[PDB]
Amino acid sequence: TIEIIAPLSGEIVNIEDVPDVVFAEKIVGDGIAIKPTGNKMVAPVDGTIGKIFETNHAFSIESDSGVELFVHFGIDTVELKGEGFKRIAEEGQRVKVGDTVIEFDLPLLEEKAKSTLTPVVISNMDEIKELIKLSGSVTVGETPVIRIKK
Amino acid sequence: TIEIIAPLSGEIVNIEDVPDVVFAEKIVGDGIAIKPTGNKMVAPVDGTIGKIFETNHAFSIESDSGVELFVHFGIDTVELKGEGFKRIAEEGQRVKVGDTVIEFDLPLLEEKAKSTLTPVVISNMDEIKELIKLSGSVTVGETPVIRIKK
Ligand SMILES: [Zn+2]
Ligand SMILES: [Zn+2]
């Protein structure tokens, strides 16, 4: 049983209500979304950064347990050409839950961005047995957001 | 105007309701208290660790602006002889808001401890002009807890 902890602070939303069919339709995979309230995206699991979008609004990670997660800030955020994001961690770096990955400017983003919702998804679903999504308000690197059986 | 940000997650309580007169009577100084909800104490300001109690349940800090804060986990926590606390940072180390200082075990502490309330206080009050305490639920290294004019 794996425990996925919040990469960022805010309220847990339904992947379904994410104004972007790639998320809403679970093309990319399944998980939850977060309506951000903080200033950073942290590592939800222990493992290794995989990729960090140029723009710095999204990143990949693969835990030691074998889970591949994809955190992606906002919708259409690429349009901001990397404006509001400071890349703290490095591609392929070894991380532990809670290690800061990216730092953002909510206020800015809130205004200049299409949407603030941040999808948190498991990219290797075929390797998934059970996925239990939680609910409520969460805090960075502290609160669990999903329970997996794999 | 300085901004003191939450060292830990939880709800902001009244220093006054802290079951320990040293806090409740403002002997040590003034601030707020937090009813913890997370798993770590982070640096509320940018500056330098000053002291770290042997037991690891409390620590001092002095920001670059000239504020001396004292974060102290729970009441009578020394009684636990350092049980439930992992000292992450080091005495006299340079830190930035959000850098983990100590890691704790709430569950444990919640059970074995007298009280969980954590006073957050400014130790050099004489250097203080104005102190504005905020209220509500806060998240680690994100939410502001106090506004100072000094
Ligand atoms: Zn994108
Ligand atoms: Zn003590």
UniProtKB/Swiss-Prot annotation, chains A, B:
Residues at which Zn(2+) binds: 57, 72
Keyword annotations of the record: Cytoplasm, Kinase, Metal-binding, Phosphoprotein, Phosphotransferase system, Sugar transport, Transferase, Transport, Zinc
CDD domains: PTS_IIA_glc
Keyword Transport: yes
Gene Ontology MF terms: kinase activity; metal ion binding
Coiled-coil zones: none
Keyword Acetylation belongs to the record: no
Protein's GO biological process: negative regulation of carbohydrate metabolic process; negative regulation of maltose transport; negative regulation of transmembrane transport; phosphoenolpyruvate-dependent sugar phosphotransferase system; regulation of carbohydrate utilization
Annotated knockout phenotype: In mutants defective in enzyme I and histidine-containing phosphate carrier protein (HPr), cells lacking this gene are able to grow on the non-PTS compounds such as glycerol, maltose, melibiose, mannose 6-phosphate, and alpha-glycerol phosphate.
Compartments, as annotated in UniProt: Cytoplasm
First-listed, main subcellular location of the protein, grouped into a coarse class: cytoplasm
Entry note: cofactor: Binds 1 zinc ion per glycerol kinase EIIA-Glc dimer. The zinc ion is important for dimerization.
Active site: 72 (tele-phosphohistidine intermediate)
Cellular component aspect of the GO annotation: cytosol; enzyme IIA-maltose transporter complex; membrane; transmembrane transporter complex
Positions of the PTS EIIA type-1 domain: 20-124
Site (Important for phospho-donor activity): 57
Subunit (UniProt): Heterodimer with glycerol kinase (glpk).
NCBIfam families in the cross-refs: PRK09439.1, PTBA
Description of its domains: The EIIA domain is phosphorylated by phospho-HPr on a histidyl residue. Then, it transfers the phosphoryl group to the EIIB domain.
Record protein name field: PTS system glucose-specific EIIA component
Organism this protein belongs to: Escherichia coli (strain K12)
